[PDB]
Design a protein around this ligand. Structure first.
Ligand SMILES: [K+]
Ligand SMILES: [Mg+2]
Ligand SMILES: [Mg+2]
Ligand SMILES: [Mg+2]
Ligand SMILES: [Mg+2]
Ligand SMILES: [Mg+2]
Lengths: 79, 71, 140, 166, 108, 94, 139, 150, 289, 49
């Protein structure tokens, strides 16, 4: 790209913000793509030791649509 | 079953070995027929002669090509 | 004739020179060092076997990441590239993904075109002549 | 036994050429076989590191430790050597560059408990080492500011390279 | 104009096959961002913030006010600034500091 | 909360581990291969009578070669060069 | 697309690339070469470490013909699975014929008194790739 | 182990082999004995192979210093300044020739772990990947939920 | 007291190692070390580089005026007459001037022929960098030119070492043809720019100003900067892509931390493309002419 | 992977099996004289014979 050494490294390891709507979307399918973006498993420069990672903004999370009867069967427990 | 494998020359896996089709060999193969893969030997160019011994190659589909990568 | 070991200084130095970077009393005491040094070498060989596996796993993640960027999954990108008789291992494909964004698009474009030809043959009667990219060239 | 601290005062440096920076003085002094313990003496030694000699004596003047008087005698007699044996003027222009405590030779005794049992008692002796350097005390380092942390973190994110790249 | 992938982001890939059949060629030139797809440079964003005159009778003052918050409030300020946690902003002991390599190998 | 009594793979009560769809396909792939195995063994080229001693000279010669090689086991020759070559230890530059 | 038009279009692209390569309008070249059982992504003025000893004297110039891939900024040529020797020529120069650092291989089993320690010194060869050339002959 | 010893990248000294190849070995010095039985391998090598070795490699200077010693040694110096000590104590003639030939082919850099089996300068031909190299541009560069100015 | 001598002597090998670590010895010349024969090294120097040198020329090139002055002080100290031989020793002052003048002329010819678009200021920076202090001293030290140089105060001062290296060029110029010395310059001085990029050797401070001037020569009105891509404007790590459009056509694009930094990088890419000094450029030819 | 496709087309399951990528010599001298044969190739031509 004929960039200088400093701006070339900065551009490659840049942080990117994503927007993900949640209007009538199951949280599991919402989390599957959100997990990939957070880890950085979409960049071909990925590596666990590196700090590669992208912000994700999820809106309309009150309108998620659980499939089947999971609204009454699935339980979240803590002590 | 171990001895029959040993006495048929099948010690190393995934290495083709040629045997006759006489009943004596077939008697031993029937015992270990669940441990081996058997395919016929095809000869598109016939049996190799003494001139083309070093150019023989055995393809995966089960045919012996006498002249392999000429020139 | 009373025989005594005199080079015992070098006997323990051959062991402690591999344990200079340890934490605690393992870098000074000989009894605790040998058990640490011996376990250090065992982990060296086992990790060396896993070094090839880990790097192969890393390459597939990079290939999958660079293939999803073009809208093509990893399983579809590999089998439909082999059908074009392109024998590139996963090591160089990862390198092409990072340092050759244009070329990796062509390989991804090649795989998608080959895949779309395979589906057309199945959808038809199966008597369709092999696709312009699906023709097999045998060297002999 | 080992006695190397005493011999550090016999080192003679070559004469300095004109124009070179003035070499600050260095005075090495120690006391051997003090009845005070090794660990107890350490806290006093840690106290006076990096302070000028005048305020170092002031702090040890009112300390209630038995070793406070012992250390104050060492500093006072080391100051006299600096101004007389060495050509160090301004006897108030010295700072304690290094102070530490070592262990001496212990005497073993028998301590009785009862039921015919006993325990070995170790009479404790310790050494004190002090080095005085001519000049004002060095300035103590302040904690890293908010900008310093941000500069290091941004620099760290800029050193990153593609691991197992080509 | 046939392409398995769209020609809008990286390059305009054009595949082809040699008449002999032993080689696959592809002409893949770059695609440049058009002028209509870019926004004007926000040049005067801190126009008054960068250069503010306190008064026209006295010279301007470069008084960078500082609070020097304690270690507590400082870390939570940086963590929120860089979108990280607070556990990595604390220093480490002498053991870890000393064992770092003074001259790490450098490639390229 | 729910435990498997004793060891989880031995005894009267075991783990309820079921068979998977992948396992069924592995069995079928092996069955198809073995189905072809027992077809190629069905029709021999020669019958039992026609193979009576067809290759016995080679078998006899193979055994005779084994006897000959095993009967040659004997200590190797000892020569003067081996004994006189030890004096070269103290070779000097005069 | 119709194969009748597809072949006609393919002729134009091959001719266009052949015109581009014949006029010397290509910049830097990279190539994927198969050598010593491994595939290397190689461009001009690089180094590659070969893990096996070669019977080549130091300073000799050797030629590699197992070129899987070649390409530049504006074009890329694929092989099926190899490119012909008359299309791309790659030459490399041997620099160093050395030995690897001592690698340790140890096997240990608990409470059976079995330890085996051996050190492996693998001979190595360092190659310098000088030039990659593309012939303008392309059907 | 790798964590115990140092590491270096694959580097050629003075960009050797690019324009021309220069034999990095500079000199050798043999310290053998005329009476010690352990120096027999060194003495046989000097009489036979040293003269022929110098002809093949005119870029090295060979020093032979027969003096009373118990462990024969050969010292090899390279252009970059690295000096490598070796012992030829009680070795056959062909072993000395193999050992000396190996020292002639080495570049002289320190023999430690090499992190990568390749080295390259400017590997980013036709560009290097950045998160904007494959994302299409929106008309006017608008953000996903940005309201147009007019 | 354990009987024996191997243990006692082997530790003396360790005691020497500790002393060197505690008190490192000052560097000394290779001449004072036991293995040295000056005439043998000179002959091997010519064969190592595959060049034919004149022995009289080389020994004239490896003697510096500093060494001659140092020797004369020793002669006066001892009061022994050697003016007939010592004073009649030609230094390398004349040879170095011939080498430096030819090297700058030869390097300029290479860059003007290979890079027609480089301005007069740019090419002057390129040749000065390759003949600078740090580049030449590194090459001379790794080529055993410093080991054979007769001078006082080892290690040889960088100004003195650069003088000696170009003296060897002067000796090669009079021994072989000028075209033969040109190959020597190409093999050991042009190769020092491999990997390095323009504006790392030709430092300028106003890329935008210089770009407009170059476009006036090329008859292009003026570049216009537009923000192509951006990611995060309130974060502490923003990323901007400033692109330059002339007549609504993209010619360069550069990233950066801020818009001002990115915009200058856009001009850097534009200048690199205009001057034919990109990173995709044809690699320097090293084949036999 | 795709070994089943390669077996269908007649090639080896493993791309290292008797293919043109393995039999051919990987290096040769610049002037053009042939390189010495590989140790592996000579061994592979002895078991085939
Ligand atoms: K059970
Ligand atoms: Mg009592
Ligand atoms: Mg006790
Ligand atoms: Mg006690
Ligand atoms: Mg249990
Ligand atoms: Mg069960």
């Amino acid at each position: 790209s004929s960039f200088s050494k400093a701006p070339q490294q900065w551009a490659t390891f840049a942080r990117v913000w994503y927007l993900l709507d949640g209007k009538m979307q199951p949280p599991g399918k919402l989390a599957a793509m959100a997990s990939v973006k957070l880890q950085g498993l979409h960049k071909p420069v990925y590596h666990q030791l590196s700090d590669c990672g992208d912000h994700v903004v999820i809106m309309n999370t009150r309108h998620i649509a659980f499939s089947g009867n999971k609204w009454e069967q699935k339980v979240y427990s803590s002590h | 079953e171990k001895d029959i494998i040993k006495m048929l020359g099948l010690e190393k896996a995934h290495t083709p070995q040629v045997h006759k089709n006489i009943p004596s060999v077939n008697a031993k193969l029937k015992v270990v027929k669940h441990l081996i893969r058997i395919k016929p030997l095809k000869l598109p160019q016939g049996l190799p002669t003494e001139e083309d011994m070093a150019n023989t190659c055995l393809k995966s589909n089960g045919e012996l090509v006498v002249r392999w990568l000429l020139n | 004739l009373r025989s005594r070991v005199t080079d015992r200084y070098w006997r323990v130095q051959e062991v402690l020179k591999h344990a200079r970077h340890f934490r605690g009393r393992k870098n000074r005491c000989y009894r605790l060092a040998v058990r640490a040094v011996t376990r250090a070498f065992v982990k060296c060989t086992r990790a060396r076997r896993l070094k090839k596996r880990s790097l192969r796993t890393l390459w597939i993640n990079r290939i999958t990441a660079a293939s999803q960027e073009h809208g093509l999954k990893y399983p579809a990108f590999i089998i439909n590239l082999i059908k074009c008789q392109v024998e590139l291992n996963r090591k160089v494909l990862a390198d092409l993904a990072i340092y050759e964004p244009k070329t990796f698009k062509s390989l991804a474009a090649l795989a998608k075109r080959r895949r779309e030809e395979g589906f057309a043959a199945a959808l038809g009667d199966g008597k369709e002549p092999d696709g312009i990219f699906s023709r097999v060239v045998q060297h002999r | 036994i080992s006695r190397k601290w005493e011999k550090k005062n016999k080192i003679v440096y070559p004469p300095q050429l004109p124009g070179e920076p003035r070499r600050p003085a260095e005075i090495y002094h120690c006391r051997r076989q003090i009845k005070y313990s090794k660990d107890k003496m350490w806290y006093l030694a840690k106290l006076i590191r990096g302070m000028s000699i005048d305020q170092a004596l002031a702090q040890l003047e009112f300390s209630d430790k038995k070793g406070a008087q012992i250390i104050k005698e060492v500093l006072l007699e080391a100051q006299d050597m600096a101004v007389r044996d060495h050509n160090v003027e301004f006897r108030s222009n010295l700072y304690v560059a290094e102070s530490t405590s070592g262990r001496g030779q212990y005497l073993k005794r028998i301590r009785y408990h009862g039921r015919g049992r006993f325990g070995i008692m170790e009479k404790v002796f310790c050494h004190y080492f002090v080095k005085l350097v001519e000049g004002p005390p060095p300035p103590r380092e302040a904690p890293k500011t908010a900008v310093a942390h941000a500069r290091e973190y941004i620099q760290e994110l800029r050193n990153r390279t593609i691991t197992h790249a080509l | 104009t046939y392409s398995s992938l769209p020609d809008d982001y990286n390059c305009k890939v054009e595949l082809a096959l040699t008449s002999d059949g032993r080689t696959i060629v592809c002409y893949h030139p770059s695609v440049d961002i058009p002028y209509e797809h870019t926004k004007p440079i926000p040049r005067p964003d801190p126009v008054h913030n960068i250069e503010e005159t306190h008064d026209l009778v006295l010279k301007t003052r470069l008084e960078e006010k500082g609070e020097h918050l304690e270690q507590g409030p400082m870390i939570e300020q940086l963590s929120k600034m860089f979108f990280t946690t607070k556990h990595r902003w604390y220093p480490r002991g002498q053991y870890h500091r000393r064992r770092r390599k003074p001259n790490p190998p450098k490639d390229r | 909360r729910n435990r498997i009594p004793g060891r989880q793979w031995i005894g009267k009560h075991r783990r309820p581990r079921p068979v998977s769809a992948q396992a069924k396909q592995n069995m079928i792939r092996r069955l198809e291969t073995e189905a072809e195995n027992q077809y190629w063994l069905s029709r021999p080229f020669l019958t039992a009578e026609q193979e009576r001693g067809h290759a016995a000279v080679r078998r006899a010669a193979a055994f005779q070669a084994l006897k000959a090689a095993q009967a040659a086991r004997f200590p190797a020759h000892r020569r003067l060069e081996e004994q006189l070559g030890h004096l070269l230890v103290t070779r000097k530059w005069s | 697309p119709d194969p009748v038009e597809e072949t006609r279009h393919h002729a134009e692209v091959v001719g266009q690339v052949n015109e581009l390569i014949a006029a010397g309008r290509y910049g830097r070249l990279f190539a994927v070469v198969h050598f010593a059982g491994h595939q290397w992504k190689v461009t001009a003025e690089d180094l590659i470490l070969i893990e096996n000893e070669l019977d080549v004297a130091c300073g000799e110039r050797i030629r590699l013909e197992k070129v899987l891939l070649v390409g530049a900024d504006n074009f890329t040529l694929l092989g099926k699975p190899l490119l012909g020797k008359e299309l791309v020529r790659v030459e490399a120069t041997v620099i160093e014929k050395t030995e690897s650092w001592p690698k340790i291989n140890m096997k240990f089993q608990k409470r059976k008194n079995y330890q085996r320690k051996r050190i492996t010194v693998n001979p190595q060869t360092v190659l310098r790739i000088n030039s990659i050339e593309i012939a303008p002959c392309l059907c | 182990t790798a964590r115990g010893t140092a590491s270096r990248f694959l580097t050629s000294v003075l960009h050797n082999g690019l324009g021309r190849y220069v034999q990095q070995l500079q000199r050798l010095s043999f310290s053998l004995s005329r009476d010690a039985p352990s120096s027999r391998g060194a003495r046989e090598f000097v009489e036979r192979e040293v003269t022929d070795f110098a002809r093949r490699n005119p870029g090295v200077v060979i020093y032979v210093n027969p003096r009373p010693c118990c462990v024969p040694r050969v010292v090899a110096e390279y252009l970059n300044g690295a000096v490598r000590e070796e012992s030829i104590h009680c070795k056959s003639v062909e072993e000395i020739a193999a050992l000396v030939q190996k020292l002639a082919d080495q570049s002289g850099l320190d023999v430690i772990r090499i992190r990568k089996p390749f080295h390259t300068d400017s590997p980013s031909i036709q560009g290097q990947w950045h998160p904007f190299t494959n994302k299409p541009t929106t008309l006017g560069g608008l953000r996903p939920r940005e309201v147009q100015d007019p | 007291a354990k009987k024996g001598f191997r243990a006692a002597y082997r530790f003396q090998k360790e005691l020497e190692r500790w002393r060197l670590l505690r008190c490192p010895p000052p560097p000394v010349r290779r001449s004072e070390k036991p293995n040295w024969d000056y005439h043998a090294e000179i002959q091997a120097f010519g064969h190592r580089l595959q060049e034919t040198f004149s022995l009289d020329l080389l020994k004239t090139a490896f003697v510096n005026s500093c060494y001659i002055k140092s020797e004369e002080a020793k002669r006066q100290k001892l009061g022994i007459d050697k003016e007939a031989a010592l004073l009649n020793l030609k230094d390398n002052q004349e040879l170095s001037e011939q080498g430096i003048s030819f090297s700058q002329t030869c390097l300029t010819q290479f860059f003007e022929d290979a890079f027609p678009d480089l301005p007069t200021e740019g090419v002057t920076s390129l040749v000065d960098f390759l003949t600078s202090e740090e580049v030449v001293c590194h090459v001379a030290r790794n080529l055993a030119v410093e080991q054979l140089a007769l001078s006082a105060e080892f290690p040889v001062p960088p100004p003195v070492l650069r003088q000696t290296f170009f003296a060897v060029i002067g000796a090669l110029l009079q021994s072989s043809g000028p075209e033969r010395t040109a190959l020597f310059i190409r093999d050991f001085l042009i190769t020092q720019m491999t990997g390095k990029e323009l504006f790392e050797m030709w430092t300028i401070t106003n890329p935008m100003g210089l770009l407009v001037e170059e476009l006036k020569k090329r008859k292009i009105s003026a570049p216009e900067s537009r923000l192509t891509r951006q990611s995060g404007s309130t974060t502490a790590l923003p990323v901007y892509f400033v692109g330059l459009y002339c007549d609504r056509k993209l010619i360069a694009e550069g990233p950066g931390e801020t818009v001002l930094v990115a915009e200058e990088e856009a001009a850097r890419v534009a200048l690199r493309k205009l001057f034919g000094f990109t990173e995709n450029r044809r690699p320097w030819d090293y084949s036999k002419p | 992977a795709g070994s089943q496709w390669r077996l269908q087309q007649g090639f080896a399951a493993n791309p290292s099996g008797y293919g043109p990528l393995t039999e051919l010599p990987d290096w040769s001298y610049a002037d053009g004289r042939p390189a010495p044969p590989m140790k592996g190739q000579l061994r592979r031509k002895a078991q085939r014979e």
